[PDB]
Amino acid sequence: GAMNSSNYAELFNNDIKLFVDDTNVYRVTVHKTFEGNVATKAINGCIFTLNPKTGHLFLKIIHTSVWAGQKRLSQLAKWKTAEEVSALVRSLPKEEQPKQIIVTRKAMLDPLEVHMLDFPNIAIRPTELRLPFSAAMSIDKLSDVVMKATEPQMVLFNIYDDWLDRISSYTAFSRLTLLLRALKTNEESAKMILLSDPTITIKSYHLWPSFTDEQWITIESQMRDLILTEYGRKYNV
Amino acid sequence: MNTVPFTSAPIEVTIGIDQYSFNVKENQPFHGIKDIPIGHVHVIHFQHADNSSMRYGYWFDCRMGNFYIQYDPKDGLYKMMEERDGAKFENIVHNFKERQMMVSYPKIDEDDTWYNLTEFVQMDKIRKIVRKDENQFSYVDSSMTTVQENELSDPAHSLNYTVINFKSREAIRPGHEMEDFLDKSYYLNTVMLQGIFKNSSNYFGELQFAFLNAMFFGNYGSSLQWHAMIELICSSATVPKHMLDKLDEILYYQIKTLPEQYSDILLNERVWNICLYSSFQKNSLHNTEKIMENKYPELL
């Protein structure tokens, strides 16, 4: 069934699984027309497909051309997501195919279930965790590749950089979920935290700065402070 | 006008004949049912006074043979049988009518209810859903499960309705996933109507039979089948206009005949609210919508 706090261990076991987040697939800017009506202009999006155990991110870039001449785009986006995830699975060798795909929003269950009927042995699951994957476009290098794309394109990243050399996947996913939750609640402050120190750089082949273990503890503490703060700032506590 | 004679009534039982029913007391001098209209399938059904568990019954057509009921004290039920000696049977019946030991099938002349509930139901099709080929009549009861129910355990005692499953490869063409899932016309018209049922009359006959088994026996899988067949039409953007118009009539008489106090378990809120208010055909079922709103506004 669904995926909740009772089973954190299953995320980091040796059964291949992927999280799928469709929240950045269909992205628009809303503006006024010359006549004073409102219209949307779509911008490039992405499907965020993540192996939580290995950190492999399958970033499918959704070029705005895919929406041309189409109706009911928010419904189509869920089916387009499903179609691209199914295409990804079929492209992987059998031994790399996932045994479970967990969708971060329940509206994806039926579109994905229907696209994956050829794969009856892959479980399609919802989750109750409130995962902050929508903030993935707050990661500069991810945003950059999506915005620059001129055509449909898949780009492969490791969202954990080299962290698994030193920490476990339960800790890497926890750090990623923490950075992303912070970037989602106050992007400016989150980003100031990550970059205040000019001497800690982001390697060309990485997404996040090269923090030592001590510096990550300080960083992680600061993101908690931020999340807790904003939460007071929000409710007045 | 045909007759279904009873050998006797050894145990107290409510007997149903189509949409009619009457109470027979233990060892009361009851010898069956006369004046049964020819030209329709019928169902004769039973609920023992002492065990309201298991409603059970027999679908039959008096044109297909001479049938009678006889209680079996070993198996504990009223059993339908066929009498092949035509002369022995007329002679039995005539003695029981002379001594007036039969109830009269009580059809009011204005009343088309039964015809309207069974318009497309044929005995030959029933016998393919209920597989027991040595007999010309078909037994159904409350507990029988459907072939599809068994896939999700006795095959000989299953209801072999046509499997409908909206998230299946049969229903969804490769490359038309979204289109076929949101507009099931392909699945209705090509897969089911042209490929499996051949015509809408067979479709409607199975739909009507499912409802009647759901109503008379509270057979849960029949109710699932009836709702699935309604939903497949309503979720199709492209339906022949005569089918829509006939569906409206079919469902209207079904909803009209349902006991008021059973609406809570025989009617799926989700299917009905979708069919009448969300689906492509939301505006095509005027009679059904009007009776549903005036009789079961709660559900909606």
Ligand SMILES: CCOC(=O)/C(C#N)=C1/CCCCCN1
């Ligand atoms: C916002 C920070 O969130 C987390 O650290 C988190 C969650 N949600 C979990 C649960 C997922 C699996 C590992 C345990 N840590």
